[PDB]
Structure formats: structure tokens, C-alpha cells
Structure 1
Amino acid sequence: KNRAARVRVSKGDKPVTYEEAHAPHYIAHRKGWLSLHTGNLDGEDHAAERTVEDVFLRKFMWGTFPGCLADQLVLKRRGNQLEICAVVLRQLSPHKYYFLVGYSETLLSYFYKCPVRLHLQTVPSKVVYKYL
């Protein structure tokens, strides 16, 4: 039985977002990629470096906003820009959110030598696409 990235139904009560609900064979069919960069195109280069950067960015953002993230990040790259679009729960006071945004933007910009922007969209609670 295939097990990759699938959320197996247990009782009909566990909530899953849109991305968690869909299985890998639905990528590019019912769900887009969580990272968009020209690395994997024909003839382009530095795919490995972009992949490592994306993995580190996801880990760093997950560990920097503990429990704040309501979904996976979206890492867009335009030129040397780097936009991290995130969906965050409305738990913390906005002061902490702004502090973390400034911190993460400056630290990532100095760590990857590229202008990193962080766009946060807040939701009252984790969006439930269905229950499993």
C-alpha cells in the first residue's frame, strides 16, 4: 500500500488542510508546488542549492514561529528576491509577530545574501478542507 505523503483515514474526525488531504499523485493536478523557482527548468542550474535553501528555510521558519504556522510555506523566487508567504494562526500578540518578521527577514537576508521578504496571512484557526 502506498504511504507517501498520504493521510490515512482513521475515524472520520481528524481535520486536514487542502494540501494534507491531497496525495502526491495530485501534484500539478489539484495542488501546486509549495516552492517556485527556475532551478528545475530545462537547462537551468543550481537546483541543489535552491533545494537546500528551501529545506533550511522551511525548518527555520517552523522553528522560529512555534505553533504559529497554520500551513506550509510558499517560497517564491523572483530574480534574487525571496518571498516567504506563510499562513499563521492568530495566537501571539502582533508585537511578537512583527518582531519575528523583522528578525527572520534580516537574519535570512544576511544568511543567504538576498533580499528576503516575509508575507504573513493570519487565520483564526487552521483551515479544515475535510475530516479524516
Structure 2
Amino acid sequence: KNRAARVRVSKGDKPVTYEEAHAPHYIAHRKGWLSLHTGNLDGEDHAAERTVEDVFLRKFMWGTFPGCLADQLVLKRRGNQLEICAVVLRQLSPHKYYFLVGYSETLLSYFYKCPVRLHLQTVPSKVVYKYL
């Protein structure tokens, strides 16, 4: 009996997402990686910094877009340029959405001394894979 990044089977009243449902040993078999960089590859370096500041990015953006997201993020770092992809709901106003978009993008760029971009996908209700 192992407990690792997996949801307990309940009576059947727990909507779950794809990755939130599937186990951590199918990350390559039936899932994709949340992040894509080369520090893990051989010969590269600074992978520790990559991971640490990626965790920081995830936490900061999760807490500066609270209650709107419904899934984990997608990182995409091509050379210099950084890209983040998110999914959110449409309860708040596009005014606030764009204001926070610009604010967060500027903060990330000024902090990392790096060109950054961020995209969001709107949803009326978070997509559920199964009822667990």
C-alpha cells in the first residue's frame, strides 16, 4: 500500500481531473510532464535553480490567481523565452483578469530578467475525468 500523489477512492462524489486522477507511475506512460526544460538532460546544469524557481512560479501564480484555476500549470521554456499556460474559470471580470495578467507578467520579467509570456484558457465548469 503506497500513497503518492493519488486520490483516495470515495463513494463516487469527487470530481477529478486527468492528472489529479491518474497515478504518478504513468507520468510517461499515460501523462505528460508539467514542465519541459533541459537541466535534467545530461551535460546541462542549473537544474536545481530551474526546479526551485519553477515551484516558486507555480505557488506565486496560484496565489495571485486564487479560486479561478482548476488544474496544474504547463511550463514551456524555449531557450530564453519563458511561457506559462493555465486554465481558469469565468466567474470574475476580464478587467481583473487582464490587470492581473499584466501585473504578474511584469513582475516575472523584472524578477527573472527574462522575457516571459502567459496564456489562459477559460472554462465554464472545470473538466472532470471521472467521479471517484
The question of a shared fold, defined as TM-score above 0.5 by the shorter chain, is answered with: yes
Distance in 1 (CA, whole Å) between partners of 2:52 and 2:91 is 30
Could you tell me how far 1:20 is from its partner in structure 2? 0.3
- Structure 1 segments of 4+ aligned residues over 3 angstroms from their partners: none
The share of aligned pairs that are identical, in percent, is 100
CA RMSD of the aligned region, Å?
Answer: 0.7
CA shift digits 1:38-61 (9 cap, x unpaired): 110111111001001110000001
Aligned position for 1:115: 115
Distance in 2 (CA, whole Å) between partners of 1:77 and 1:85 is 11
Relative to the length of structure 2, the TM-score reads 0.98
CA shift digits 1:74-100 (9 cap, x unpaired): 111011111010001111110000001
In the TM superposition, 1:32-43 aligns within 5 A as 32-43=32-43
1:39 counterpart SS class: coil
Gaps of 5+ in 1: none
Could you tell me how far 1:10 is from its partner in structure 2? 1.2
Count residues in correspondence. 132
Relative to the length of structure 1, the TM-score reads 0.98
Distance in 2 (CA, whole Å) between partners of 1:91 and 1:37 is 33
Distance in 2 (CA, whole Å) between partners of 1:63 and 1:4 is 24
